[PDB]
Amino acid sequence: LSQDFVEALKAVVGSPHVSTASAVREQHGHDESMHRCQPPDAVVWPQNVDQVSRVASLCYNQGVPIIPFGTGTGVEGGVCAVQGGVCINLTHMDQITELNTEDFSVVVEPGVTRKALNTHLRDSGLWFPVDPGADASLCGMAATGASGTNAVRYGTMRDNVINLEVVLPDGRLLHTAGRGRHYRKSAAGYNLTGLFVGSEGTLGIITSTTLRLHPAPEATVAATCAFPSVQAAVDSTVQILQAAVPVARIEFLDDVMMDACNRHSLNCPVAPTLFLFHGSQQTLAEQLQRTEAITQDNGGSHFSWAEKRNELWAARHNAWYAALALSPGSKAYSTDVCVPISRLPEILVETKEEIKASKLTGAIVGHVGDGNFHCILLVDPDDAEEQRRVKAFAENLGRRALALGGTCTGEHGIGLGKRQLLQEEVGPVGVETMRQLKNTLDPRGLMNPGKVL
Numbered sequence: 001l002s003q004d005f006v007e008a009l010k011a012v013v014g015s016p017h018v019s020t021a022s023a024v025r026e027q028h029g030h031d032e033s034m035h036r037c038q039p040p041d042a043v044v045w046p047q048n049v050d051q052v053s054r055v056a057s058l059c060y061n062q063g064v065p066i067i068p069f070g071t072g073t074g075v076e077g078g079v080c081a082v083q084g085g086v087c088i089n090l091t092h093m094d095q096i097t098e099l100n101t102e103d104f105s106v107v108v109e110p111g112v113t114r115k116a117l118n119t120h121l122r123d124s125g126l127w128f129p130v131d132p133g134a135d136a137s138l139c140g141m142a143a144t145g146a147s148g149t150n151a152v153r154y155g156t157m158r159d160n161v162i163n164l165e166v167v168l169p170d171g172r173l174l175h176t177a178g179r180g181r182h183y184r185k186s187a188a189g190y191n192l193t194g195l196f197v198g199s200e201g202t203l204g205i206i207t208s209t210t211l212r213l214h215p216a217p218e219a220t221v222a223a224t225c226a227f228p229s230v231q232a233a234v235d236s237t238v239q240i241l242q243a244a245v246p247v248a249r250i251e252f253l254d255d256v257m258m259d260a261c262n263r264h265s266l267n268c269p270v271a272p273t274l275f276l277f278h279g280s281q282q283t284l285a286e287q288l289q290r291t292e293a294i295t296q297d298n299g300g301s302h303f304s305w306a307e308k309r310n311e312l313w314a315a316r317h318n319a320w321y322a323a324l325a326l327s328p329g330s331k332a333y334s335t336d337v338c339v340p341i342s343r344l345p346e347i348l349v350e351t352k353e354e355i356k357a358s359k360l361t362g363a364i365v366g367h368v369g370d371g372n373f374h375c376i377l378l379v380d381p382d383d384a385e386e387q388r389r390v391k392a393f394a395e396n397l398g399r400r401a402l403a404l405g406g407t408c409t410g411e412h413g414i415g416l417g418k419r420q421l422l423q424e425e426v427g428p429v430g431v432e433t434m435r436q437l438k439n440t441l442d443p444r445g446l447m448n449p450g451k452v453l
């Protein structure tokens with residue numbers, strides 16, 4: 001990057017908010033995945049949306065790539081600057097606005113994390129349910145199309161994003177559903193909000209998100225349930241969903257994951273396990289009765305039932321790091337397939353068998369209520385042959401999911417790792433259509449290049 005360009009950036013955001021230092025760039029050249037660090041040429045922290053617009057227009061017209069950066073917790077290399085350019089760290093815009101408790105909505109800027117929002121909402125009787133394990137930027141979660149353990153009942157980001165404020169690549173400001181609007185449903189024109197959810201920073205920069213809030217549940221019960229086999233755990237899950245029990249969370253851990261989480265955080269029996277209800281005192285008893293009946297018929301243990309619940313779900317949210325702690329110094333790559341629920345037993349049991357018959361260390365954890373799971377595969381950062389084997393494993397598993405009518409990623413996204421799988425998933429006309437949308441919004445191809453498509 002030229003000296004005149006760097007001075008132009010500083011003129012927009014202020015000297016302290018532009019850095020070309022190698023260490024600062026290296027910290028912004030990678031996320032939590034195994035993808036190799038590729039540092040941007042500069043990092044910029046805009047202080048308001050006018051500055052985001054002016055930074056984007058400066059980069060765009062000079063032919064400099066733009067990489068939006070939230071909290072850097074992605075796992076597909078979305079923030080790696082494969083073509084250099086300017087990394088725009090958005091987290092100094094960190095204000096919550098327009099809290100409308102009577103309408104169940106709130107507007108947040110990119111520096112707001114889910115934990116910050118729910119802290120702000122204490123005493124309101126409302127909460128925001130979409131809960132990825134990491135304390136990520138909510139706007140970053142909109143950009144990746146994230147979900148979480150609560151999504152089986154309360155929906156994903158796609159279900160809970162009502163509106164987005166987006167700086168387009170050339171700096172124009174778009175409010176996808178209209179400035180200041182919030183409502184339950186609309187048929188007005190084409191739905192632009194859904195286009196930018198899951199766009200991973202390749203179509204523009206999300207500078208605020210309007211979120212749907214939910215009422216806090218009247219009563220909560222959490223429990224764990226140990227099974228004799230992966231088959232028995234996943235059959236129970238499928239049967240619970242087919243019985244229409246409105247479980248609030250239903251998370252699967254294989255025995256490897258359960259032992260890893262025990263060691264990193266618990267003392268649950270080392271076995272394929274379900275972490276599991278919201279409603280009134282009496283509603284819970286019915287849900288529990290129907291769910292315990294199904295789990296018992298598949299060999300589940302009696303359920304192992306305001307501090308131990310928090311510790312239970314904190315251990316699940318840290319499963320990624322529990323897995324990494326199995327082999328210190330290693331990095332991780334995760335699969336993320338989502339299949340029609342009736343096919344979940346076959347593919348989960350097959351994955352377990354394939355991990356066991358392999359030399360790789362893999363732990364399985366997942367949002368199985370959605371038909372979704374992660375195979376977290378560990379890699380030695382220097383063992384290039386192990387790295388080729390994890391990639392081959394992840395690609396085989398993704399193709400098996402596609403063969404079953406599913407998708408190669410339920411929530412993490414495509415980034416750098418799944419671009420060939422996406423082409424297989426949607427086919428030539430799907431790829432061309434996505435590319436035409438990318439081209440009309442980002443003609444010069446400068447909005448996070450090398451990702452998704």
Ligand SMILES: Cc1cc2nc3c(=O)[nH]c(=O)nc-3n(C[C@H](O)[C@H](O)[C@H](O)COP(=O)(O)OP(=O)(O)OC[C@H]3O[C@@H](n4cnc5c(N)ncnc54)[C@H](O)[C@@H]3O)c2cc1C
Binds near residue numbers: 077078131133201
């Ligand atoms: C321990 C752990 C657990 C996780 N659990 C889950 C889980 O349960 N579910 C799940 O879905 N994910 C999960 N993730 C992945 C990650 O937390 C999510 O993908 C999250 O949405 C990433 O947000 P971020 O701001 O940290 O993203 P970053 O890594 O900063 O960016 C991710 C991508 O989005 C783009 N981007 C970021 N912010 C914006 C913006 N404001 N506008 C436009 N583009 C933007 C970036 O360019 C990049 O391509 C987990 C990650 C970790 C480390």
